[PDB]
Amino acid sequence: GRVADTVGTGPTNSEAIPALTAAETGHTSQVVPSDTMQTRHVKNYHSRSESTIENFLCRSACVYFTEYENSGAKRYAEWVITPRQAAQLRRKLEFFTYVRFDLELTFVITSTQQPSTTQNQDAQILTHQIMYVPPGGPVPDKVDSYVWQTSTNPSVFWTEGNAPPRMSVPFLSIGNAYSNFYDGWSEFSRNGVYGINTLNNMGTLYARHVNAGSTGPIKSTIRIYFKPKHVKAWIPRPPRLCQYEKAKNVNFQPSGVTTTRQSITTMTNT
């Protein structure tokens, strides 16, 4: 892959008019800078590589995180899988109407002590469990519930001090691609939930401590990272303008087109 060459040109007097066209045809003129002026023969070795889709969408990104503790009310963290709860990733996928790719998950887990008066706290190495539950499956309501046996559901056992865990997932959609934007209802009566929320059922993701690990309370932090691969795309569109509001719908707060400046002639931003 390489940039095209700019071919040289001498003077010109002739009835052929490159510099004119009609944009009303919805046709972007192909005119190259050699047409409207004199140009020297130049070889360009610049490459378009880093502009390909693959390098554009493929970077790890932090979609979300939770907090679960070693004791008390919340002993585990549950999250439904949507990319849209993190701003900067969701925008990178809103260029393309229909996207296709294979997720690569990576988790980053950290632990934190909590203030308490407990005496003779002595740590031990904690062990985190991460369980995936495809839709409709059983839902644990308590940490010791039988569902954690994971007779089937893919699950990962992890330990502090080791490398962050990683697993790859193939393309899970029913149709021929994921859909970022969907106009329609879920019900033939045009009622109920509107928007893309209906298409998205990915199941649920859970995590827990395996063992108490110490006498004193401990709070943990988990982080998910997507890294799309093998990407294909279709039907690009305008980037989003107004700040996001909700994760279930495109709702926005009306905001201006751009920033402003002084009188048209003024050559500097304000």
Partner 1 sequence: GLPTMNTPGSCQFLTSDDFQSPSAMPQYDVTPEMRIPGEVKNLMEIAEVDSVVPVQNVGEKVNSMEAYQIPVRSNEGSGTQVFGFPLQPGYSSVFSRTLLGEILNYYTHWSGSIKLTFMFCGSAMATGKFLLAYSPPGAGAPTKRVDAMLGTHVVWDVGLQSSCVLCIPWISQTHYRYVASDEYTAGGFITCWYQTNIVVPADAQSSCYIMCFVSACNDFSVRLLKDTPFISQENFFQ
Partner 2 sequence: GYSDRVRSITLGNSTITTQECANVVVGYGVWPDYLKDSEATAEDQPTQPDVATCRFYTLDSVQWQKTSPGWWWKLPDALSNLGLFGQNMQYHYLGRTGYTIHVQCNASKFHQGCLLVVCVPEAEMGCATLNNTPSSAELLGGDTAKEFADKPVASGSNKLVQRVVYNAGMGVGVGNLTIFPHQWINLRTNNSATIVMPYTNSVPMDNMFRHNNVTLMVIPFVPLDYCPGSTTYVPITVTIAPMCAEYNGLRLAGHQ
Partner 3 sequence: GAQVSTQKTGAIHYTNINYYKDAASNSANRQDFTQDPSKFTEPVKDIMIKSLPALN
Task: Examine residue 52 and tell whether it contacts partner 3 (CB under 8 A).
Answer: yes
Residue 16's binding partner out of ligand PLM, partner 1, partner 3, none, with CB under 5 to 8 Å set by partner kind = partner 3
**What angle is formed at CA 86 by the lines to CA 131 and CA 242, rounded to 5 degrees?**
155
What's the rounded Cα separation, in Å, for the pair 107 and 66? 12
Closest CB to partner 1 among residues 74, 166? 166
Q: Give the x/- contact pattern for partner 2 in 210-239, rule: CB under 8 A.
A: ------------------------xxxxxx
Closer by beta carbon to ligand PLM, 42 or else 169: 169
Binding residues for partner 3 restricted to 149-208, rule: CB under 8 A: 168-171
| Residue 21 or 38 with smaller CB distance to partner 3 | 21
Site membership for ligand PLM, residue 204 (CB under 6 A): no
By the rule CB under 6 A, 198 interacts with ligand PLM: no
Report the partner that residue 134 touches, choosing among partner 3, partner 1, ligand PLM, none (CB closer than 5 to 8 A by kind).
partner 1
Query: Rounded distance, CA 68 to CA 80, Å?
Result: 16
Cα–Cα–Cα angle for 247, 249, 252, rounded to 5 degrees: 95
Structure tokens at 42: 């130049």
Alpha carbons 257 and 270: distance in angstroms, whole number: 15
Closest to ligand PLM by CB, 97 or 179: 179
Residues 25, 151, 269, 270: which binds partner 3 (CB under 8 A)? Answer: 25
Nearest approach in angstroms of CB 33 to partner 3 is 13
Site for partner 3 in 56-85 (CB under 8 A): 58
Using an 8 Å Cβ cutoff, are 85 and 64 in contact? Answer: yes
For 97, other C-beta atoms within 10 Å of its C-beta total: 15
Closest CA to 132 of 144, 146, 150: 150
User: What CA–CA distance (Å, rounded) separates 267 from 133?
Assistant: 57
204 binds partner 1 (CB under 8 A): no
**Which residue, 266, 245, 265, 246, is CA-closest to 255?**
245
> Per-residue x/- mask for partner 2, residues 36 to 75, rule CB under 8 A?
----------------------------------------
CB 117 within 8 A of CB 212: no
Among 212, 209, 1, residue whose Cα is nearest residue 122: 212
CA distance 192 to 194: 6
x/- binding map, residues 1-20, to partner 3, per CB under 8 A?
A: x--------------xxx-x
Site residues (vs partner 2, CB under 8 A): 22-27, 97-98, 174-179, 181-191, 193-196, 234-242, 245-246, 249-257
